[PDB]
């Protein structure tokens, strides 16, 4: 079995300059982008990350050529949704790095 | 396919993706509150020619028509006004607590 | 109604639950069977498999830990090899690798099978399958399954229960309709389909 | 050239539009589109209500 | 809200930090192991790697300067060769570069 590795990047609002008007922190005024700079990227609406922190789950493989996925399982997750379910459902919103390398 | 001595099967199986998934989605709390409150006060868009619902809810009924037909033994000026009133939309209250929108206002 | 949905429920269903099938295709017959009138190795064998067709099909059920269900063909235990040993041995026989044309895994082979997932026990019809011994007498023996014929495929039904299950019910029922709610069906492998739940009859 | 792993790039609107929108929100609050009771005295200095 | 964003924060995260893996796939066994026993060279070896599969996998961790981490397998030092030497060596033997997939 393969398993997921978690990368904790800290407070999801870190790095943005906070304006007095909090609505300026929402999309489309702010956005969090996740990219591998190899053709894959995903714009996240920071407010819809159901967690105080931005956590990224890495998944991979040892098959015929390179394949790594970067997920934000908390994105658009209902609060009652389990971690297992979040991870499962996150694949269609993930950075799929499948350049063969 | 698996090698002999088209897609990355190892990544999928190794990470537990097989079979079919049912993912259920609904709109965010913010829009649920927004729309729910609107429907609560003003009902739904109907776009039907039918007799209007006047007293089908316990507390209040909102009614808005277009070009409504209303008859009766009434002088025509007053009858014309009544058509106009429902064509502009009106809320018919069925309890004395008029204007209190907090209540459930369930059927019957 | 905003620009994103909450994912509020996630469920997974596999046709045969924990069991998957390995499929091996060859140009000709690779196996012996117990009680066969004469040797058939390297014979061409056409059969009904969805349609008339000239290749030989072998299948092998397995679990992710490499174990395999106790499999019966008719009244008889097929004595299936564990999948990893089977692969090693099958590709070690120089006569069998010349015949082999393709290999893949699938979640569903077109049949409802008499399968007990909890007991890890599979019963197959002897008119459609047979014990397949693939022997070298230099490398270890393989016991797998040969597909004699599958004239027609069939649908398997999965009952997921109440279609409104998992959604939170609002007082205003119209918030249960599309576009406020949606049921998505996906295999997470590039195929997906948005269903308007109210229209599932 | 050192490109490996994953990158988190955080983006926000330019100073010109921040000034623009912030000043509008400061004076006129937010678009709400809710049926509810209005906020009449929730701020220390003023409340806009429409 | 304008036509462009300011990039206001940039961060990079790698699963194994400075370490990368080279993966080499062959049709059959290319190696000896401590405490053999009989030779297994050119034997077919299937294994569970994500799923059941018939290829042989070798991996080799490395850093961008060509060094390799002190690696233990169980209690035993693996004594890894430097990545460059390993490459030169694997591809120098016709017995077999033809096995390498």
From Swiss-Prot, chain C:
Disulfides per UniProt: none
Record gene name: 9
Function: Distal (knob) tail protein that plugs the end of the tube before DNA ejection and forms a channel perforating the host membrane during ejection.
Subcellular location: Virion
Span covered, complete protein: 153 to 353 of 599
Source taxon at top rank: Viruses
The protein's name: Tail knob protein gp9
Gene source species: Bacillus phage phi29 (Bacteriophage phi-29)
Subunit note: Homohexamer; forms a hexameric tube structure with six flexible hydrophobic loops.
From Swiss-Prot, chain D:
Subcellular location: Virion
Domain of life: Viruses
TM stretches of this protein: none
Subunit-structure text: Homohexamer; forms a hexameric tube structure with six flexible hydrophobic loops.
Main function: Distal (knob) tail protein that plugs the end of the tube before DNA ejection and forms a channel perforating the host membrane during ejection.
Record protein name field: Tail knob protein gp9
């Amino acid at each position: 079995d393969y398993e997921a590795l978690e990368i904790d990047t800290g407070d999801k609002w870190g790095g943005f300059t906070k304006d007095q008007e909090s609505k300026l922190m929402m999309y489309p005024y702010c956005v969090t982008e996740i990219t591998d700079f190899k053709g894959n990227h995903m714009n996240l609406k920071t407010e819809y990350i159901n967690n105080s922190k931005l956590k990224i789950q890495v998944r991979g493989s040892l098959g015929v050529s390179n394949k790594v996925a970067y997920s934000v399982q908390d994105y658009n997750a209902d609060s009652a949704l389990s971690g297992g379910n979040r991870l499962t459902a996150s694949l269609d919103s993930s950075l799929i790095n499948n350049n063969p390398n | 396919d698996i090698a002999i001595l088209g897609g990355n099967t190892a990544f999928d199986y190794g990470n537990g993706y097989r079979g079919v998934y049912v993912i259920k989605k609904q709109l965010k709390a913010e829009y649920r509150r927004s729309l729910s409150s609107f429907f609560h006060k003003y009902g739904y868009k109907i776009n039907r020619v039918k007799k209007p619902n006047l007293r089908t809810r316990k507390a209040f009924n909102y009614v808005q028509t277009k070009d409504c037909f209303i008859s009766g033994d009434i002088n025509n000026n007053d009858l014309q006004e009544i058509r106009t009133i429902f064509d502009n939309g009106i809320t018919l209250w069925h309890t004395d607590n008029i204007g209190n929108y907090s209540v459930e206002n369930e059927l019957r | 109604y905003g620009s994103e949905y909450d994912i509020v429920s996630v469920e997974n269903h596999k046709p045969y639950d924990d069991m998957m099938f390995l499929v091996i295709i060859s140009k000709s017959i690779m196996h012996g069977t117990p009680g066969e009138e004469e040797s058939r190795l390297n014979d061409i064998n056409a059969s009904l498999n969805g349609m008339p067709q000239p290749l030989c099909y072998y299948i092998h059920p397995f679990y992710k830990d490499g174990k395999v269900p106790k499999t019966y063909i008719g009244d008889n235990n097929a004595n299936l090899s564990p999948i990893v040993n089977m692969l090693t041995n099958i590709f070690s026989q120089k006569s069998a690798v010349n015949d082999i044309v393709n290999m893949y895994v699938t979640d569903y082979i077109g049949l409802k099978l008499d399968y007990k997932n909890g007991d890890k026990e599979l019963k197959l019809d002897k008119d459609m399958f047979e014990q397949a011994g693939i022997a070298d007498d230099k490398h270890g023996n393989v016991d797998t399954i040969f597909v004699k014929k599958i004239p027609d495929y069939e649908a398997l039904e999965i009952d997921t229960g109440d279609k409104w299950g998992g959604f939170t019910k609002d007082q205003e029922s119209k918030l249960m309709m599309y576009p406020y709610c949606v049921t998505e069906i996906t295999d997470f492998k590039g195929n997906h389909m948005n269903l308007k739940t109210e229209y599932i009859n």
